[PDB]
Design a protein around this ligand. Structure first.
Ligand SMILES: CC(C)[C@H](C(=O)Nc1ccc(C(=O)NO)cc1)c1ccccc1
Ligand SMILES: [K+]
Ligand SMILES: [K+]
Ligand SMILES: [Zn+2]
Length: 359
């Protein structure tokens, strides 16, 4: 395929690691194989341009991560199960496996491949069907099922290799991507928007900096936007309203040259962790709402999502929009609930001093 195409990256290596000490761990290889099977069954896979993965290089990793941390992660490939468990336990909410590092390197590289093809007009947009996820990973630590911060690396790579000046990262996973926030906290060239379950800190990762008062600092003040949900059960209308009132006006003002999406599907109805009630079809609309900016240069990368069917359906819905199919009518009312409106209004109050579009 070519310029007006939608890229897809998937490699069998993404199934080559799993939790050795918890057979019920939610972050498991079926997450990606099920997505690929549904894309095929739906006839969507054959409409995409198959893009090869590549392994990230050390220098690419060092755009975000420390040399000491990269070397330590590299060494996990030669550690016994006991050593892997001891190291994993020094971080919050991670496991390790002898194949984790190799898959993590292909996970980062998959996004870089799509950035290359989108930025050079060889594709319109794309989706990497990758695990492990990335948005919690930090400069010198694993966190939240993540080793390397796929999208943070991709953003800095777009700036370094393709000389992009402004990148928008949209994170619709149900969890706050605090790793992305930290990496870009002082950086006005990367705008980070996250909508996430918070419940006044009750929900993991339990961080005060996941609240909307965290707007970035220094030159980056105004370029970090958190939308915390404080009740479970949010629906499509809550997300669409947030995008319409808050994200889209800011995004147009920011004028990004590339949009990267932390495309988790743990907010979809049925997810065992997220507690939300978003229909998979909503993600067709959310994807569509991001395509009118950055010349449509839009790259999605899989983050969380743990109900195999719900996550596969959410990926398929997003892919239909990437491919240009007209959006479905959504049955649920587009009106947001009172709690969602309260969070949106609060985030707007915290960000209005930095965005003319919010005044
Ligand atoms: C104890 C509990 C708090 C922990 C957990 O839920 N973690 C977690 C972190 C990140 C994501 C995600 O999807 N981020 O995008 C999802 C889940 C956990 C760990 C192991 C097995 C089950 C549960
Ligand atoms: K999020
Ligand atoms: K930022
Ligand atoms: Zn998540």
């Amino acid at each position: 395929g070519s310029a007006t195409g939608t890229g897809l990256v998937y490699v069998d290596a993404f199934t080559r690691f799993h939790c050795l000490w918890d057979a019920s761990h939610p972050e498991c290889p079926a997450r990606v194989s099920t997505v690929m099977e549904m894309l095929e069954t739906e006839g969507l896979l054959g409409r995409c341009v198959q893009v090869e993965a590549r392994a990230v290089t050390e220098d690419e990793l060092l755009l975000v991560h420390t040399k000491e941390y990269v070397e330590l992660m590299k060494s996990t490939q030669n550690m016994t199960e006991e050593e892997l468990k001891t190291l994993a336990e020094k971080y919050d909410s991670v496991y390790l496996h002898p194949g984790f590092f190799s898959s993590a390197c292909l996970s980062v590289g998959s996004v870089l491949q799509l950035v290359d093809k989108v930025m050079t007009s060889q594709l319109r947009n794309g989706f990497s069907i990758n695990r492990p996820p990335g948005h919690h990973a930090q400069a010198d630590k694993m966190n939240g099922f993540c080793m390397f911060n796929n999208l943070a690396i991709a953003a800095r790579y777009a700036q370094k290799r393709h000389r992009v000046q402004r990148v928008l990262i949209v994170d619709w996973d149900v969890h706050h991507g605090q790793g992305i926030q930290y990496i870009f906290e002082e950086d006005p060239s990367v705008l980070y928007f996250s909508v996430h379950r918070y419940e006044d800190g009750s929900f993991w990762p339990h961080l005060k900096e996941s609240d909307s008062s965290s707007v970035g600092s220094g030159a980056g003040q105004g370029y970090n936007i958190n939308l915390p949900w404080n009740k479970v059960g949010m629906e499509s209308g809550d997300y669409i309203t947030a995008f319409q009132q808050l994200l889209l006006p800011v995004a147009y003002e920011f004028q990004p040259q590339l949009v990267l999406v932390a495309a988790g599907f743990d907010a979809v109805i049925g997810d065992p962790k997220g507690g939300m009630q978003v229909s998979p079809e909503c993600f067709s609309i959310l994807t569509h709402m991001l395509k009118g900016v950055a010349q449509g240069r839009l790259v999605l990368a899989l983050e969380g999502g743990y109900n195999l069917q719900s996550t596969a359906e959410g990926v398929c819905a997003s892919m239909r929009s990437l491919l240009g199919d007209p959006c479905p009518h959504l049955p649920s009312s587009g009106a947001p609930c009172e709690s969602a409106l309260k969070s949106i209004s609060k985030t707007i109050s915290d960000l209005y001093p930095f965005w003319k579009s919010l005044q």
